[PDB]
Ligand binder design. Structure first.
Ligand SMILES: Nc1nc2c(ncn2[C@@H]2O[C@H](CO)[C@@H](O)[C@H]2O)c(=O)[nH]1
Ligand SMILES: [Ca+2]
Ligand SMILES: [Ca+2]
Ligand SMILES: [Ca+2]
Ligand SMILES: [Ca+2]
Length: 129
């Protein structure tokens, strides 16, 4: 029951961009497809997403723009799956672009990093069947 060009996996439909957008734009894009930026809640889901994105920085539906870490669909961050890269998240200001780092993305090895929301990265949308 996924739309055409979406990939079905464990009761979810995924769409993998082949272009980049700033996090807020990627967020708006997913919402307009009645979907959200991918919410990763298991090791199995992480591996599935990694397979399709490859070694490329890719936005996910996890951010801390208004304070504590939140998943875009309300999934609790504290008791949920996490796959941060060691020493991440670090809310780095050293990039000199203003602010810390408020948006999460999969890195080239799949592990997560918090980065500057304005960066154009590829993204993944997810909808639940
Ligand atoms: N402290 C520090 N972290 C860095 C530096 N360059 C990159 N990073 C980190 O590496 C991430 C990119 O993979 C950034 O979001 C930061 O967390 C640097 O010069 N200093
Ligand atoms: Ca999910
Ligand atoms: Ca932050
Ligand atoms: Ca970081
Ligand atoms: Ca950039």
């Amino acid at each position: 029951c996924c739309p055409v060009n979406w990939v079905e996996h464990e009761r979810s439909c995924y769409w993998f961009s082949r272009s980049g957008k700033a996090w807020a734009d990627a967020d708006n894009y997913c919402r307009l497809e009645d979907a959200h930026l991918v919410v990763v809640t298991s090791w199995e889901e992480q591996k599935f997403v990694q397979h399709h994105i490859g070694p490329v920085n890719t936005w996910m539906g996890l951010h801390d723009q208004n304070g504590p870490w939140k998943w875009v669909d309300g999934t609790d961050y504290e008791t949920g799956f996490k796959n941060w890269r060691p020493e991440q998240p670090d809310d780095w200001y050293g990039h000199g672009l203003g602010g810390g780092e408020d948006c999460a993305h999969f890195t080239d090895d799949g592990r997560w990093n918090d980065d500057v929301c304005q960066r154009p990265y590829r993204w993944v949308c997810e909808t639940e069947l």
